Coordinates of C-alpha atoms and ligand atoms in Angstrom, one line a residue:
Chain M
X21 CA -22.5 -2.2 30.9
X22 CA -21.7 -5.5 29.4
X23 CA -20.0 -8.8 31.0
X24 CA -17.4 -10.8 28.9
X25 CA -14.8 -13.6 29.5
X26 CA -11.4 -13.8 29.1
X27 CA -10.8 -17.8 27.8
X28 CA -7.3 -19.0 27.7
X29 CA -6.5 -20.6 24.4
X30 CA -3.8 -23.0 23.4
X31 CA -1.9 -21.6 20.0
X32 CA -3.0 -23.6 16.9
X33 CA -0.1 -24.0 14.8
X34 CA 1.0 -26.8 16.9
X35 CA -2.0 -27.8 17.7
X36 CA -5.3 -26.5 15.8
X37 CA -7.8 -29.5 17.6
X38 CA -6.5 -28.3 21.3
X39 CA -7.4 -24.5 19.9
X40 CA -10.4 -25.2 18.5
X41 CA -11.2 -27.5 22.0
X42 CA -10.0 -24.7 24.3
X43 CA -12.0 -22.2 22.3
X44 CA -15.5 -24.4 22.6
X45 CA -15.1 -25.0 25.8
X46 CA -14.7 -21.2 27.3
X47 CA -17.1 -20.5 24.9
X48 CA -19.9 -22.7 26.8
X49 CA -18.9 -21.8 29.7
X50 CA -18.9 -18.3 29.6
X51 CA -22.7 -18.7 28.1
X52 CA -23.4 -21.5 30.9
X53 CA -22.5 -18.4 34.0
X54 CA -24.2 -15.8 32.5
X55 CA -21.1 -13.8 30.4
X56 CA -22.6 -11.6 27.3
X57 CA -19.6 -12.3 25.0
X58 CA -15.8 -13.5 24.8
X59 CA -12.9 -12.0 24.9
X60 CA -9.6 -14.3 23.2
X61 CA -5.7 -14.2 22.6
X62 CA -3.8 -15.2 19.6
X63 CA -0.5 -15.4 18.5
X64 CA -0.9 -15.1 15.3
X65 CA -4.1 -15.6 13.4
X66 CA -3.2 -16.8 10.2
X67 CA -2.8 -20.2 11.6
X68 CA -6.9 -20.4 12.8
X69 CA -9.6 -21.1 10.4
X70 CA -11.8 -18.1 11.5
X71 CA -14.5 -19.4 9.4
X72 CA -15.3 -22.1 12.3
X73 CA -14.9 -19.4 15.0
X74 CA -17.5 -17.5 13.5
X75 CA -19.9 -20.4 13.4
X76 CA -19.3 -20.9 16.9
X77 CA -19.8 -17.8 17.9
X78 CA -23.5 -17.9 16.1
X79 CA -24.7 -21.2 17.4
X80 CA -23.7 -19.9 21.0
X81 CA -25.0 -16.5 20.4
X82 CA -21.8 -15.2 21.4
X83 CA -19.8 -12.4 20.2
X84 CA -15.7 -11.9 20.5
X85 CA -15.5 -8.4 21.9
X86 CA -11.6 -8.2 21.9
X87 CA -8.4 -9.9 20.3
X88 CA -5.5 -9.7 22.4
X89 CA -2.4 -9.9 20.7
X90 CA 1.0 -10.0 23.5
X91 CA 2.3 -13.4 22.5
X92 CA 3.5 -11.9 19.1
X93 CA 5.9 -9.7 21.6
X94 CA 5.9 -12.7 24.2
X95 CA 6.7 -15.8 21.8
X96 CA 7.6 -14.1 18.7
X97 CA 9.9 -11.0 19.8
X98 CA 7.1 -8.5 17.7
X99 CA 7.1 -5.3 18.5
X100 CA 5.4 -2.0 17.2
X101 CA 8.7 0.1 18.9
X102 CA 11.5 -2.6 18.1
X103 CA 15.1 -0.6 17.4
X104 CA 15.0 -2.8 14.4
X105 CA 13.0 -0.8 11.9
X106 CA 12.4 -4.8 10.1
X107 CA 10.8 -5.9 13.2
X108 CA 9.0 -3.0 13.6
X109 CA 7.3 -3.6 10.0
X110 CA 6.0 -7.6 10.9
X111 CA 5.0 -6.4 14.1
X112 CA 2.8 -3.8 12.0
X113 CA 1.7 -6.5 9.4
X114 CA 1.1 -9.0 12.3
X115 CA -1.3 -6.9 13.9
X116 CA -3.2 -5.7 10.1
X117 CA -3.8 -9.7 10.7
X118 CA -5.4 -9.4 13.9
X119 CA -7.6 -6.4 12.7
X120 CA -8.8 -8.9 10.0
X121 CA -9.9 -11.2 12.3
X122 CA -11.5 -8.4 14.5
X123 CA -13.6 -7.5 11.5
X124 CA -15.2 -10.5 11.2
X125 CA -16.5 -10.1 15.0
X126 CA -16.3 -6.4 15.5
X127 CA -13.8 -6.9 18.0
X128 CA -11.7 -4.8 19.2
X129 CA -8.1 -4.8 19.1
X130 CA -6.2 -4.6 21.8
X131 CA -2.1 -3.2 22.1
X132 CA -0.4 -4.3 25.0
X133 CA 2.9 -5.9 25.5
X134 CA 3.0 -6.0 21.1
X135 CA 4.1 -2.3 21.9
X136 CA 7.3 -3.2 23.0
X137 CA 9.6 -1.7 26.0
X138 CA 12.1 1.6 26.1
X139 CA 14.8 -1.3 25.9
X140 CA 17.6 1.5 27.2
X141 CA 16.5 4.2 25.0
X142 CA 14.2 7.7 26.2
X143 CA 11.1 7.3 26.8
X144 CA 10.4 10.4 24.1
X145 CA 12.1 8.0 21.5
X146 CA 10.1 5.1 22.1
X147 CA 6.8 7.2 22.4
X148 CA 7.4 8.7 19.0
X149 CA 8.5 5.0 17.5
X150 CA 5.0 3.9 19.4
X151 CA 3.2 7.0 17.7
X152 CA 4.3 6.4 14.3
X153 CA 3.5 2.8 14.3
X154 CA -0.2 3.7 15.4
X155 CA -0.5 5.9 12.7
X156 CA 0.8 3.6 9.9
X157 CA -2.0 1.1 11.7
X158 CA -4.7 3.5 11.3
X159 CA -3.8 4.2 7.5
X160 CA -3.5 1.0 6.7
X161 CA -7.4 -0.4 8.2
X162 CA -10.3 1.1 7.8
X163 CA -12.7 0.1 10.1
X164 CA -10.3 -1.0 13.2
X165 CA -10.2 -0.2 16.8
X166 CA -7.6 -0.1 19.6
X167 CA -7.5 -0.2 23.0
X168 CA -3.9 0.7 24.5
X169 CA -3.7 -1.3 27.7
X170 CA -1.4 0.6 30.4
X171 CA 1.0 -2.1 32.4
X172 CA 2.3 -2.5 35.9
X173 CA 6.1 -2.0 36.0
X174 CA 7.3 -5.7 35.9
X175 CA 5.7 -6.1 32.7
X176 CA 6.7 -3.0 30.6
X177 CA 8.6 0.8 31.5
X178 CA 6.7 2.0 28.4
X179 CA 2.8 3.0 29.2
X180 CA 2.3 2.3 32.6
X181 CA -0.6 4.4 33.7
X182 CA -3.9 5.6 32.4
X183 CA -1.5 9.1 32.0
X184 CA 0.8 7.5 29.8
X185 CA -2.1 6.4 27.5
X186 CA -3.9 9.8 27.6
X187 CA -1.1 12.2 26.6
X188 CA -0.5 9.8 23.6
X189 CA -3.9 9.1 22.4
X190 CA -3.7 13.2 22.3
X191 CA -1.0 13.0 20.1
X192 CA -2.4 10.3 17.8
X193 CA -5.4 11.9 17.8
X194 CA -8.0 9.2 16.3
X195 CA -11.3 8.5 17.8
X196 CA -9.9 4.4 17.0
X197 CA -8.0 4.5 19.9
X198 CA -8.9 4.5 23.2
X199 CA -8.2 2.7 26.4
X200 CA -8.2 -0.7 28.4
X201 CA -7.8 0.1 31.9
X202 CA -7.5 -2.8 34.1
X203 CA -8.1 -2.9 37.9
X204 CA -5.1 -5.6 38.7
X205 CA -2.3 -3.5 36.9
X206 CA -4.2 -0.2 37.9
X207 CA -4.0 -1.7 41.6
X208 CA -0.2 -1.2 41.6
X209 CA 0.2 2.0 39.3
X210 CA -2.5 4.3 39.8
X211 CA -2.4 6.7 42.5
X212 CA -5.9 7.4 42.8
X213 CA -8.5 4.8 40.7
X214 CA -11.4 6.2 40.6
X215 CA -10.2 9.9 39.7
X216 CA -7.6 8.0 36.4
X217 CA -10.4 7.2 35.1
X218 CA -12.4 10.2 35.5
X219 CA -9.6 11.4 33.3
X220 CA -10.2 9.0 31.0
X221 CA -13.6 9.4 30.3
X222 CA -14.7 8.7 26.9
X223 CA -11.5 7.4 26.1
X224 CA -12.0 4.1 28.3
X225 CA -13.4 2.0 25.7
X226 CA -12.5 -1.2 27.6
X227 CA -12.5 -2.8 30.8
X228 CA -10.4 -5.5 32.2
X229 CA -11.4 -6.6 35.7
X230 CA -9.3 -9.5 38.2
X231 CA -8.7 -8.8 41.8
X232 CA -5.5 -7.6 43.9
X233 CA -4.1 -10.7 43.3
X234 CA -5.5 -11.8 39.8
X235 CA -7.9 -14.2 40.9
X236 CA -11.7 -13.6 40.5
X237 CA -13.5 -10.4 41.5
X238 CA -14.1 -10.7 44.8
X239 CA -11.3 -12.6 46.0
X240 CA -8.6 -9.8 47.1
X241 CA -8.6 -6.6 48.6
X242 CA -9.3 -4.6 45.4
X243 CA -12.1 -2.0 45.9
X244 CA -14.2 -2.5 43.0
X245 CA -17.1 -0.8 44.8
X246 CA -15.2 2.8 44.1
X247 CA -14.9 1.8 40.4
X248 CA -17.9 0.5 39.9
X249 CA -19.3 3.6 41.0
X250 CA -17.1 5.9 39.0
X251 CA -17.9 3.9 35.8
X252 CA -21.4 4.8 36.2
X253 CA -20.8 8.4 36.7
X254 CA -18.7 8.6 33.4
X255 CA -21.0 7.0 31.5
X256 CA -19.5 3.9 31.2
X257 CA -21.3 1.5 29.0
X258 CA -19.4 -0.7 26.7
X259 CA -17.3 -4.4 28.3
X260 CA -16.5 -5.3 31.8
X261 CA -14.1 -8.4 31.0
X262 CA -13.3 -10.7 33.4
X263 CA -9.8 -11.7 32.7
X264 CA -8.1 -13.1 35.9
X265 CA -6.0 -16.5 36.6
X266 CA -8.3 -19.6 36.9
X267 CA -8.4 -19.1 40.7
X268 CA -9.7 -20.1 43.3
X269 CA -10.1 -24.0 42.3
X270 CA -10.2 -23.4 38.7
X271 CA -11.4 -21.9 35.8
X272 CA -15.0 -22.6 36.0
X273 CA -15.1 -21.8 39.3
X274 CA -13.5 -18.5 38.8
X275 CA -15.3 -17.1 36.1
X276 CA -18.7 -17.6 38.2
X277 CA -17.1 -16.1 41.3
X278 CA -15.9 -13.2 39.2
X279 CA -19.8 -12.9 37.6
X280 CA -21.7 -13.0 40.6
X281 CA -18.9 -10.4 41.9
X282 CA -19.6 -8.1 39.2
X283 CA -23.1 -8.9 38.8
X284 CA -23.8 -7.1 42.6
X285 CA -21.5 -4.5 41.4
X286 CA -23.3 -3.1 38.7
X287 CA -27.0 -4.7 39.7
X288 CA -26.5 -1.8 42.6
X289 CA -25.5 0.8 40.1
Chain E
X21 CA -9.1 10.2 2.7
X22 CA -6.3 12.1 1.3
X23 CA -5.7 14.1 -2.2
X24 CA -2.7 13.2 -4.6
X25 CA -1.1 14.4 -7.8
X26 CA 0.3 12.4 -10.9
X27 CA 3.2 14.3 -12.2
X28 CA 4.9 13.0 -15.3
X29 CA 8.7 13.3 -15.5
X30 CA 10.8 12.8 -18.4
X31 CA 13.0 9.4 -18.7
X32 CA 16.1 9.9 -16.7
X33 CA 17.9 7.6 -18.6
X34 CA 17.7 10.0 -21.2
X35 CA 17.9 13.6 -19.9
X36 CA 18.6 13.0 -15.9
X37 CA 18.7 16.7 -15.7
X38 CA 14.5 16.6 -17.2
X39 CA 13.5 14.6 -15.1
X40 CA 14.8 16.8 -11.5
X41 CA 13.2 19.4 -13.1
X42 CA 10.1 17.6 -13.7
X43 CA 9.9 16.3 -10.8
X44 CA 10.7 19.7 -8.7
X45 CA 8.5 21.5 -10.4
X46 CA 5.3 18.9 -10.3
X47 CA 5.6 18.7 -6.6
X48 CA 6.2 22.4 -6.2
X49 CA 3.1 22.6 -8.2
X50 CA 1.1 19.8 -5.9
X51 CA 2.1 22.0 -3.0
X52 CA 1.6 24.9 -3.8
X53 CA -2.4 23.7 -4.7
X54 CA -2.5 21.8 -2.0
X55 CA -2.1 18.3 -2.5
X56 CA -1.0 16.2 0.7
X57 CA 0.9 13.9 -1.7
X58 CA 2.5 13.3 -5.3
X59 CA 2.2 10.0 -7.5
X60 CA 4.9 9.3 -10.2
X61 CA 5.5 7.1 -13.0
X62 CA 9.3 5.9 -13.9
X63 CA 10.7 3.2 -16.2
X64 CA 13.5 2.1 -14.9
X65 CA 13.9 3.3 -11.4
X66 CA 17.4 1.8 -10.7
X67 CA 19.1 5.2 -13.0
X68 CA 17.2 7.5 -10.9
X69 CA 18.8 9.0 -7.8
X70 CA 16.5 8.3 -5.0
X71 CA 18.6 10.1 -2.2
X72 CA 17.9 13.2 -3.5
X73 CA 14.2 12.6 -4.7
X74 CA 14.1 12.0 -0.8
X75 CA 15.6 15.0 0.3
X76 CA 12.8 17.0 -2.0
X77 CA 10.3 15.1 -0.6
X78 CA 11.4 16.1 2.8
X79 CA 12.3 19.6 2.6
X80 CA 8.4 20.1 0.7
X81 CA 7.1 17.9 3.4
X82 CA 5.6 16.0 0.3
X83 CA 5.3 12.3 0.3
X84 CA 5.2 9.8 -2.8
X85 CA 2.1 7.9 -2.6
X86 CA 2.5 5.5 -5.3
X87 CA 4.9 4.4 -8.1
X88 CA 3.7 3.8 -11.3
X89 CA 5.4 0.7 -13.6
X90 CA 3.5 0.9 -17.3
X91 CA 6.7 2.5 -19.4
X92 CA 8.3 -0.7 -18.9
X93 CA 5.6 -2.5 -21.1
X94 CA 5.4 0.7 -23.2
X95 CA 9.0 1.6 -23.9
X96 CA 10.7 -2.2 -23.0
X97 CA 8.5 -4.5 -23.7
X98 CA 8.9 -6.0 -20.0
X99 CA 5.7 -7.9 -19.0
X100 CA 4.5 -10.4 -16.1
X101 CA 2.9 -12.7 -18.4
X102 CA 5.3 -12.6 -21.5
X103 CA 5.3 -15.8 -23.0
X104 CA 8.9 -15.4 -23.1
X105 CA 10.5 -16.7 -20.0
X106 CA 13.5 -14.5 -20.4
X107 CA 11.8 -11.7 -20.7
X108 CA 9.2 -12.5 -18.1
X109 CA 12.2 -13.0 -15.2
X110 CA 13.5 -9.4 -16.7
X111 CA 10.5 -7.7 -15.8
X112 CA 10.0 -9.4 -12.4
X113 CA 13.6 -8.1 -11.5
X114 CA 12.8 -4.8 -12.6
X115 CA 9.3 -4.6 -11.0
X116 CA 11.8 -6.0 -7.9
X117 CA 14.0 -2.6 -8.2
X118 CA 10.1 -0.1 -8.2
X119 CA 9.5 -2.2 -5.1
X120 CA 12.9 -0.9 -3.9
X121 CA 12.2 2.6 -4.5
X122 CA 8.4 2.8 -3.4
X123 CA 9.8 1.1 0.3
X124 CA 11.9 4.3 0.4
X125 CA 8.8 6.5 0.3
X126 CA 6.2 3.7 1.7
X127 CA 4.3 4.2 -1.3
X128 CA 2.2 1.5 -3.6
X129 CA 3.6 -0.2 -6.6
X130 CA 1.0 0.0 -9.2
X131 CA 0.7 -3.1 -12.1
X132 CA -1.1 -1.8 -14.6
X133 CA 0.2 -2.4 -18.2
X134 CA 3.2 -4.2 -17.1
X135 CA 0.8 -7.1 -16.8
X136 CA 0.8 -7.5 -20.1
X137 CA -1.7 -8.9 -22.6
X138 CA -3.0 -12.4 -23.5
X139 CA -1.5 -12.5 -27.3
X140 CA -3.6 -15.3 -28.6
X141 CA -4.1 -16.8 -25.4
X142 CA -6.5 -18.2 -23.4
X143 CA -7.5 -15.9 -20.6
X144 CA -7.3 -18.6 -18.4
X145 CA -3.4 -19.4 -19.3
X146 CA -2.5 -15.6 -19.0
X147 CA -3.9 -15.6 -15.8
X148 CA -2.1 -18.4 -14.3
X149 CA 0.7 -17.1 -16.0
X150 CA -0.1 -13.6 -13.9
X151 CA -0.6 -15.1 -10.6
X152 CA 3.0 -17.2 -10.8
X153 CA 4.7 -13.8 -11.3
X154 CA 2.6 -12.0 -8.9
X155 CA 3.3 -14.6 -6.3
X156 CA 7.0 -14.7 -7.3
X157 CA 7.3 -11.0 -6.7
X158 CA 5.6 -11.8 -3.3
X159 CA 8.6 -13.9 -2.4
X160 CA 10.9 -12.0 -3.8
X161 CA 10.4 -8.9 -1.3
X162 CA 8.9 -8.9 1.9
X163 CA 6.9 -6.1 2.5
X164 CA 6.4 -4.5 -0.7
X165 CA 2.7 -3.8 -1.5
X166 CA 1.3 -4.1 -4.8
X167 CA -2.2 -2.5 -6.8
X168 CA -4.1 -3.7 -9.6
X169 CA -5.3 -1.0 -12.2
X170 CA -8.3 -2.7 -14.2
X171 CA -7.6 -0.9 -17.8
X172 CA -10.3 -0.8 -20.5
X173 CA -10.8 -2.9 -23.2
X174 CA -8.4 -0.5 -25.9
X175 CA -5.3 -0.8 -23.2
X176 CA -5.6 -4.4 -22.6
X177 CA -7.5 -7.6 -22.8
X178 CA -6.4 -8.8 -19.7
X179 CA -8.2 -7.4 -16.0
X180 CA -10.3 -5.1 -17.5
X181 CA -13.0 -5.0 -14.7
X182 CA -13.0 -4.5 -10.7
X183 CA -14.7 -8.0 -10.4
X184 CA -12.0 -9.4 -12.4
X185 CA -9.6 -8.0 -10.2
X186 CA -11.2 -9.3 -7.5
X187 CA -10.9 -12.9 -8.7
X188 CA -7.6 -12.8 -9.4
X189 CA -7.0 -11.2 -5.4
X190 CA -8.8 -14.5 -4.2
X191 CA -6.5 -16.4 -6.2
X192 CA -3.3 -14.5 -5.0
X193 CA -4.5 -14.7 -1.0
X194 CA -2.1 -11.6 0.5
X195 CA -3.1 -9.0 1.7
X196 CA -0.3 -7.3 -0.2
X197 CA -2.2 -6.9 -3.3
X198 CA -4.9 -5.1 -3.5
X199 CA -6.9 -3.0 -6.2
X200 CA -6.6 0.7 -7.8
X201 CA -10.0 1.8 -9.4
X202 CA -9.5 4.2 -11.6
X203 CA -12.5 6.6 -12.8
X204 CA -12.0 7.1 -16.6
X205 CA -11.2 3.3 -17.2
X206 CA -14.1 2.8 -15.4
X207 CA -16.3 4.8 -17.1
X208 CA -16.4 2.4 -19.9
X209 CA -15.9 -0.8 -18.0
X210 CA -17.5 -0.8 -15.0
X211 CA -22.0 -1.3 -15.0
X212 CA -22.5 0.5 -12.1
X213 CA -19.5 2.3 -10.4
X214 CA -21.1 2.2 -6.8
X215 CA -21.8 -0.9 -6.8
X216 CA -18.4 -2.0 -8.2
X217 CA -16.6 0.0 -5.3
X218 CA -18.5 -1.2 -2.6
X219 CA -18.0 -4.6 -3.9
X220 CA -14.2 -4.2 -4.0
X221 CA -14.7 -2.5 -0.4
X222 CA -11.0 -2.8 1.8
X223 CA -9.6 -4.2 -1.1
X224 CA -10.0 -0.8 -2.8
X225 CA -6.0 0.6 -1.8
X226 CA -5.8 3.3 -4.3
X227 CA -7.7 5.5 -6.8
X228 CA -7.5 7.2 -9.8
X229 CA -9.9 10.6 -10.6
X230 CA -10.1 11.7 -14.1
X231 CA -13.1 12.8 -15.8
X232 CA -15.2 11.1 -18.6
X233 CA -12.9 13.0 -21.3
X234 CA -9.5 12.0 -19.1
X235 CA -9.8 16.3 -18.5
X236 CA -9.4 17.4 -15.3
X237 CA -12.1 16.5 -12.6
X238 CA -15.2 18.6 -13.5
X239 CA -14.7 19.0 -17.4
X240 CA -16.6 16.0 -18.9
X241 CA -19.7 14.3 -17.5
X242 CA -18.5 11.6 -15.0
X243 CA -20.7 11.4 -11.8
X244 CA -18.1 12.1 -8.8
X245 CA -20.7 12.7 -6.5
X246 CA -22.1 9.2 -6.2
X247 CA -18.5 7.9 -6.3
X248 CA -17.3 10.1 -3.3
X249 CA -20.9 9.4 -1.3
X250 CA -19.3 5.5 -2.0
X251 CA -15.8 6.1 -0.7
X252 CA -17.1 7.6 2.6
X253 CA -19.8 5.0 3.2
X254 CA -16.7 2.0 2.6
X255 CA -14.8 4.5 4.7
X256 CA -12.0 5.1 2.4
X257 CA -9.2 6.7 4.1
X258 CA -6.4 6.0 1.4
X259 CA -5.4 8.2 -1.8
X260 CA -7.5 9.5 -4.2
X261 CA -4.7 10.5 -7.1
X262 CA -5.5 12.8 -9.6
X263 CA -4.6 10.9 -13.5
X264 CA -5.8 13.5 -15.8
X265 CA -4.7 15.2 -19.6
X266 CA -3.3 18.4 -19.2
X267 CA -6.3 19.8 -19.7
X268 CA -8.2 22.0 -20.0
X269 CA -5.4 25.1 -20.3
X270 CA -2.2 22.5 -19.1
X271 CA -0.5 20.6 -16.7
X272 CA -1.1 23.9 -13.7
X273 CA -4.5 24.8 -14.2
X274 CA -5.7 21.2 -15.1
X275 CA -4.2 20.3 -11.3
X276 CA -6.2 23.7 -10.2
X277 CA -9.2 22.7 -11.2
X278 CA -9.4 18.8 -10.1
X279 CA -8.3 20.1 -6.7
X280 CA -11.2 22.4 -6.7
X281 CA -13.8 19.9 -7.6
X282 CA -12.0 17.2 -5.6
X283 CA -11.7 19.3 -2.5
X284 CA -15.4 20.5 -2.4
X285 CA -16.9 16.6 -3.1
X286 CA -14.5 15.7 -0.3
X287 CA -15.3 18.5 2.4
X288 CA -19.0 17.4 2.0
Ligands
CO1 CO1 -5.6 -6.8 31.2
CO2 CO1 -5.2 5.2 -13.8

């Protein structure tokens, strides 16, 4: 098992020199605590010279494990389910971007709130609009991977549990896809933690770790202990990726709380 | 990676009846073989019925994977780099209408000899001349997607070679065009085709397989073998299309036998 940081990043459209700033700075401090690569969020990344990302990422030694994309839902209304079939399409074509970007890193690619939400219809119809649109992202890139990220139920009514992504990774039925399972939405919609991800298995090919309350590992009530121990016994062996709010007292502070947390964890493993 | 059929239909324009039963019986044909998808080639798109071209598609559960655009240099002179700016805007619009059709199906417009040729012109000005109307088509629809057949030296003097292509992509910058390598155009043009392929890499979106004769897959001398151990290594998962003469024995048993060889280079 690997550790990686979340870092916040301001959108560079806007403002490419707070990006670029933001980006440097997580960047140095997740190699100052200890972290073994990166984990970012864009918008939209035809906006960021990558070229500069990459040469940051190889005078830090480095890598970008994952590419989060929900503000293309969040600020730009995309979505891979939208009832309108033109939406649906830039939502597909914004996230071919993303996979271009995660090529240059071998990052993977994660689908969260990009997949959209029932928005009054069944749940069947916006599984099989959700299906689809995985599949037309799987012909269309050849070397991309994607982690479908189940949500707590303030967030999204579509994919909620580790369930929800199982039956339709069955259905889409590409070894490209897997799972994110994380432990603060998990904390709220999983019955039972450590036996959703037995079920998992080798379909978790991510991990995103906060507390009960999103702050740092170790700074709630979650039982990471249990999971921790359950990873090991599935064979867990890919990212543990700290991605929690900047608490307590900030950032910095958070993201070495959250390693030393996680550091015991799998030390003891 | 998936197995396609070119079927040729007559021009509707002229016999609209032909060209249904053309079209029926090519992708009854593809089917029935064992093709997952049929390519066509039309002139003017917008006196075809579509609707029902869907409806057949549908009830064969047979999709179109590509369009193909060349009869409208061949027959009507239409080219994205005719020096005439008349003529140039006609065949943007009608290269608009393919785009129309091929979003129907999700399929690839193909700009082969539509292009057009330099006519006593620099490369350099036919180029330029290329990459306005390329870029105009880009604007003028929004999600239409667009491959680059390099043709020998005999079809064209303009984009005769993968790198060539590539060039011009680079110049272009959307990822809505891309490049369609085609076997027998590269058996002349191409130094080494292994190298060429992985060299065009993602930006390979379609293929053409015809042997060294243009017979079907497996009845000239053309080294498939190395190409297919190429397209699994790039990890091609797009359509290899079968382009080939009627031959040997005609348009049925030439589509036999290319599935045959196609079919075993692609199970191992
Ligand atoms: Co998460
Ligand atoms: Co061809």
């Amino acid at each position: 098992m690997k550790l990686s940081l979340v870092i916040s990043t301001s959108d560079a459209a806007f403002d490419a020199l707070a990006f670029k700033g933001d980006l440097r700075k997580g960047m140095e401090l997740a190699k100052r605590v200890g972290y073994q690569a990166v984990e970012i969020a864009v918008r939209d990344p035809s906006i960021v010279d990558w070229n500069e990302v990459k040469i940051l990422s190889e005078e830090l030694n480095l890598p970008i494990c994952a590419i989060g994309t929900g503000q293309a839902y969040l600020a730009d209304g995309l979505s891979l389910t939208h009832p309108n079939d033109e939406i649906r399409k830039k939502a597909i074509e914004r996230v071919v971007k993303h996979t271009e970007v995660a090529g240059m890193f071998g990052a993977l690619v994660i689908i969260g709130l990009v997949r959209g939400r029932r928005e009054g219809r069944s749940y069947e119809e916006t599984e099989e609009l959700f299906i689809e649109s995985m599949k037309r992202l799987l012909e269309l890139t050849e070397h991309a991977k994607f982690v479908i990220e189940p949500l707590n139920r303030y967030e999204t009514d579509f994919i909620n549990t580790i369930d929800d992504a199982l039956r339709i990774l069955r259905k889409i039925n590409s070894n490209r896809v897997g799972i994110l399972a994380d432990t603060f939405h998990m904390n709220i919609e999983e019955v039972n933690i450590p036996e959703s991800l037995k079920r998992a298995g080798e379909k978790l090919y991510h991990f995103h770790v906060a507390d009960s309350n999103r702050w740092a590992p170790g700074c709630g009530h979650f039982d990471f202990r249990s999971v921790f121990n359950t990873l090991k016994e599935i064979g867990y062996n890919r990212y543990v990726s700290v991605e929690c709010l900047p608490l307590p007292g900030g950032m910095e502070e958070a993201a070495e709380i959250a390693f030393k947390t996680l550091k015991e964890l799998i030390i003891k493993l």
